[PDB]
């Protein structure tokens, strides 16, 4: 379907968009006490794999799944909350603020770099077709 460069750069754009979405969702839920069921929000992470279609030669980036972080959930002593345990510590998400802003900046700069790569390739693509005519 897609040309190889198109597929690689478009996969890069989609992967960076997914990472930015995960960062934004984490930054929104930084102060959430409960979900829809009664469990604390867990910071999400996105794992980049190389989609090496040929044997070890090249390939874009794919995202296998969005994993839930395994870090000590923040404990805040609020015994009056219905979600407090026997000891009374309500669970707040493990979303760090600085890491998510850094992730947003890095995802934006990778997105823009891949955009520039596509823009650069495009002129050569259109100029290839003048070879025959």
């Amino acid at each position: 379907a897609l040309l190889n460069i198109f597929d690689i750069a478009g996969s890069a754009l989609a992967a960076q968009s997914k990472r930015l979405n995960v960062a934004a969702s984490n930054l929104a839920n930084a102060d959430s006490v409960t979900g829809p069921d009664g469990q604390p929000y867990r910071a999400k992470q996105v794992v980049f794999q190389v989609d090496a279609a040929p044997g070890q030669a090249t390939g874009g980036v794919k995202v296998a799944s969005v994993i839930e972080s395994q870090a000590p959930e923040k404990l805040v002593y609020e015994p009056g909350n219905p979600l407090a345990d026997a000891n009374g510590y309500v669970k707040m998400p493990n979303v760090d603020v600085v890491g998510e802003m850094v992730n947003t900046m890095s995802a934006s700069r990778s997105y823009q770099a891949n955009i520039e790569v596509l823009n650069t390739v495009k002129s050569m693509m259109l100029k290839t077709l003048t070879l025959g005519q």
């Binding site: 989609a14 829809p36 069921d37 009664g38 794919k62």
Partner: peptide
Amino acid sequence: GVPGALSNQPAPPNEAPIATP
């Protein structure tokens, strides 16, 4: 399967409830 493939079936509706039903 892969995001961006072609299927003959529409995706299910995107519901996001606020409380558990």
